[PDB]
Amino acid sequence: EDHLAKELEDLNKWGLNIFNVAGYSHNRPLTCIMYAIFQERDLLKTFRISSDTFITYMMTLEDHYHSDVAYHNSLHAADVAQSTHVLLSTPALDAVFTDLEILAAIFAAAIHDVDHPGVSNQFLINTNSELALMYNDESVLENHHLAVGFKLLQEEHCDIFMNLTKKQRQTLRKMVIDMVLATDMSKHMSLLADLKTMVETKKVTSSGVLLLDNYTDRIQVLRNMVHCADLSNPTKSLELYRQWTDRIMEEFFQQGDKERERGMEISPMCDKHTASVEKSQVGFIDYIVHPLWETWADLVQPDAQDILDTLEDNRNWYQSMIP
Numbered sequence: 098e099d100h101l102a103k104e105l106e107d108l109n110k111w112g113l114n115i116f117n118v119a120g121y122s123h124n125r126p127l128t129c130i131m132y133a134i135f136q137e138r139d140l141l142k143t144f145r146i147s148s149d150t151f152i153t154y155m156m157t158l159e160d161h162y163h164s165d166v167a168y169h170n171s172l173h174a175a176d177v178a179q180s181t182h183v184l185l186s187t188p189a190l191d192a193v194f195t196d197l198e199i200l201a202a203i204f205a206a207a208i209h210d211v212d213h214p215g216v217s218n219q220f221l222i223n224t225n226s227e228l229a230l231m232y233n234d235e236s237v238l239e240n241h242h243l244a245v246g247f248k249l250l251q252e253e254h255c256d257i258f259m260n261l262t263k264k265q266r267q268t269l270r271k272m273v274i275d276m277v278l279a280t281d282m283s284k285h286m287s288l289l290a291d292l293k294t295m296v297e298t299k300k301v302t303s304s305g306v307l308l309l310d311n312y313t314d315r316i317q318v319l320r321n322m323v324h325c326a327d328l329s330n331p332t333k334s335l336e337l338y339r340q341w342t343d344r345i346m347e348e349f350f351q352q353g354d355k356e357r358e359r360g361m362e363i364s365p366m367c368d369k370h371t372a373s374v375e376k377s378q379v380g381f382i383d384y385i386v387h388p389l390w391e392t393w394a395d396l397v398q399p400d401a402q403d404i405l406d407t408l409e410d411n412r413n414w415y416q417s418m419i420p
């Protein structure tokens with residue numbers, strides 16, 4: 098409505114507020130945002146994607162995200178897709194990516210947690226879920242979100258890539274698989290270490306813009322971009338970040354409840370009788386988020402300085418919340 102258009106003014110901005118846009122779109126954040134993103138970047142015009150076909154695909158996809166799961170619902174995909182959309186425009190990455198790589202990264206963000214059940218890879222493996230057997234324990238969740246998302250492009254009324262070259266559907270299907278698999282947290286370190294090596298040997302043009310050789314380097318930056326977008330809640334305005342903290346702790350504690358119901362051992366950050374929400378967020382910033390964004394900032398400097406500042410600041414709020 099009228100509040101929707103006022104909010105979508107901030108589309109291309111880190112301050113954008115995803116809750117507000119969920120409330121104004123009949124609980125369809127992901128469809129509203131993805132649709133605004135394509136228009137903005139002119140993707141439908143570029144890849145002859147019909148608008149009907151696009152809405153039908155998104156709506157279906159949004160509706161495969163479970164709405165009774167506290168954190169991994171359509172809101173989070175919408176968030177990660179909007180965050181990625183901004184990082185893609187960061188000044189240090191200007192004119193570096195092809196249209197196809199841009200469409201790949203945002204699409205990756207959109208389908209990247211689809212059909213998530215609200216339990217970890219570790220849980221699903223220890224309970225012998227169908228999914229763990231299906232996937233032999235390797236990026237269980239991630240391989241699944243990728244299969245669902247690419248299955249839904251089977252219908253004609255949903256094949257939004259129907260007007261790419263064969264070579265383009267392949268080059269894309271490859272980039273997406275690579276980016277979603279990289280959001281599996283057990284790959285975090287390898288990715289961070291790989292990022293640090295890329296910064297070490299960074300090269301720019303005379304105008305402070307990165308020089309990325311060919312495929313290998315371009316997709317490593319995209320890998321890392323969607324992984325920062327996935328771990329961007331603490332770089333967002335305090336009000337937004339605490340609402341994200343509440344939802345993730347909700348989801349985590351429902352998992353701790355199911356673990357206990359079943360005599361299994363409870364993972365301490367999922368234990369609702371001993372885990373401080375506050376200590377845990379500080380830890381999450383000190384050992385995972387800051388190390389990553391610090392490295393990202395070095396790569397696109399000084400574009401992410403504001404982001405680093407917001408982060409240290411949000412850090413100290415949570416620190417000051419602990420006795």
Ligand SMILES: COc1ccc([C@@H]2CNC(=O)C2)cc1OC1CCCC1
Nearest residue numbers: 282330331341342345366377378381
């Ligand atoms: C807003 O914070 C968080 C945001 C996102 C996630 C991802 C989804 N699940 C993950 O393991 C990473 C975890 C968070 O916090 C958890 C780390 C321990 C405290 C809660």
Ligand SMILES: [Mg+2]
Nearest residue numbers: 209210280281
């Ligand atoms: Mg995920």
Ligand SMILES: [Zn+2]
Nearest residue numbers: 177209210327
């Ligand atoms: Zn995610």
